[PDB]
Design a protein around this ligand. Structure first.
Ligand SMILES: Cc1cn([C@H]2C[C@H](O)[C@@H](COP(=O)(O)NP(=O)(O)OP(=O)(O)O)O2)c(=O)[nH]c1=O
Ligand SMILES: [Mg+2]
Ligand SMILES: [Mg+2]
Ligand code: NA
Ligand code: NA
Length: 326
DNA sequence: CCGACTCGCATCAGC
DNA sequence: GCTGATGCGA
DNA sequence: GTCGG
């Protein structure tokens, strides 16, 4: 990271606009600029140099020049001193508490960690578990642990039905040396885009993982998406592993490649690829890639037989998962 | 100059 | 209960 | 906040 200081500054500004200003497009603007600078293979010398990159306009160019000259940003220094901003930015770090709820909690005088802990009855379920594992959820997961978790999930899933296929995506599939959480794609031949020949396909998997005490908590749970908490087993006299966030996503089996492309990421890579898809006259979700008729409505799903096919349509060279970490 | 920047689950308002 | 919007998150 | 039209 040749420009770590610059990208940190931009990320912190992105978090401000998202959590405090509640301006999601400014959040995305700052995160795009941070991303494009992160992969820039030179140590940036000026805001003008950075301005040539796509996503870096005039305003960010000015802030880069201020940072390079002084090592600080006065706009950020003020934001850090603001109490409401500081309180909201902290509260939103609890999973389940977004910008809206964070601002509402502050109005009611709930703005610290002990505040949250004494007002548990004013949290919904997701928020209560997010508070419960606040410390754990901010810890990274070494790939070594990710490999153990993959081993458990894939085997427990096989025990339920051998026709399941569990694929670990996210930063792990991109080959990250450490991950923020675990992301699992799930397929079963009974569930396709044409029909669902078996009920509770995701349920049975979740229940099995609970049965062996891998899954410990549930944030949300529906037909196709599970969002919860898991933990590795520790041997005798060991300090326990931290509790980890786990997402499980059931996708129609015939729509695997669109699914695995989506969940592999990164999130900014997905935004860029889908934006590029639009400019090429296609639209992409986790299910399909569809053309746009000039009238502006999506047409019928095009044939997809690999991840590369999706790249081919929008005229991108194929990029390995390890080169999608934007 | 300025419109525009994919979806699942929880929860709530309105009927 | 159903529908559609909002919040939050992947 | 940025940018393509
Ligand atoms: C947050 C987010 C995620 N995704 C997709 C891309 C991610 O790689 C995938 C899993 O989300 P994640 O676990 O929050 N991101 P990650 O696995 O790439 O990185 P890490 O968990 O922080 O290590 O979901 C989106 O398509 N839009 C999003 O806004
Ligand atoms: Mg992840
Ligand atoms: Mg995740
Ligand atoms: Na630029
Ligand atoms: Na949060």
């Amino acid at each position: 990271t040749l420009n770590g200081g610059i990208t940190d500054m931009l990320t912190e500004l992105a978090n401000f606009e998202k959590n405090v200003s509640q301006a999601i497009h400014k959040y995305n603007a700052y995160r795009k600029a941070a991303s494009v600078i992160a992969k820039y293979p030179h140590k940036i010398k000026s805001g003008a140099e950075a301005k040539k990159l796509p996503g870096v306009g005039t305003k960010i160019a000015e802030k880069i020049d201020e940072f390079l000259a002084t090592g600080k940003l006065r706009k950020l220094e003020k934001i850090r001193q603001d109490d409401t901003s500081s309180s909201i930015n902290f509260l939103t770090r609890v999973s389940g508490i977004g910008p809206s709820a964070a601002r509402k909690f502050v109005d009611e005088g709930i703005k610290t960690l002990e505040d949250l802990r004494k007002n548990e009855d004013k949290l919904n379920h997701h928020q209560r578990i997010g508070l419960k594992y606040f410390g754990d959820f901010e810890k990274r997961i070494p790939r070594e642990e990710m490999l153990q978790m993959q081993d458990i999930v894939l085997n427990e899933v096989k025990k339920v039905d051998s026709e399941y296929i569990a694929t670990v995506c996210g930063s792990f599939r991109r080959g990250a040396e450490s991950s923020g959480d675990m992301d699992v794609l799930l397929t079963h031949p009974s569930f396709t885009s044409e029909s669902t020949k078996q009920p509770k396909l995701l349920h049975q998997v979740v229940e099995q993982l609970q049965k062996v005490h891998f899954i410990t908590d549930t944030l949300s749970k529906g037909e196709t998406k599970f969002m919860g908490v898991c933990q590795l087993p520790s041997k005798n006299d060991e300090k326990e592993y931290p509790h980890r966030r786990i997402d499980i996503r059931l996708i129609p089996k015939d729509q695997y490649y669109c699914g695995v492309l989506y969940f592999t990421g990164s999130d900014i890579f997905n935004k860029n690829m889908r934006a590029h898809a639009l400019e090429k006259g296609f639209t992409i979700n986790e299910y399909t890639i569809r053309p746009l008729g000039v009238t502006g409505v999506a047409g019928e799903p095009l044939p997809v037989d690999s991840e590369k096919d999706i790249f081919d349509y929008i005229q991108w060279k194929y990029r390995e998962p390890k080169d999608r970490s934007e």
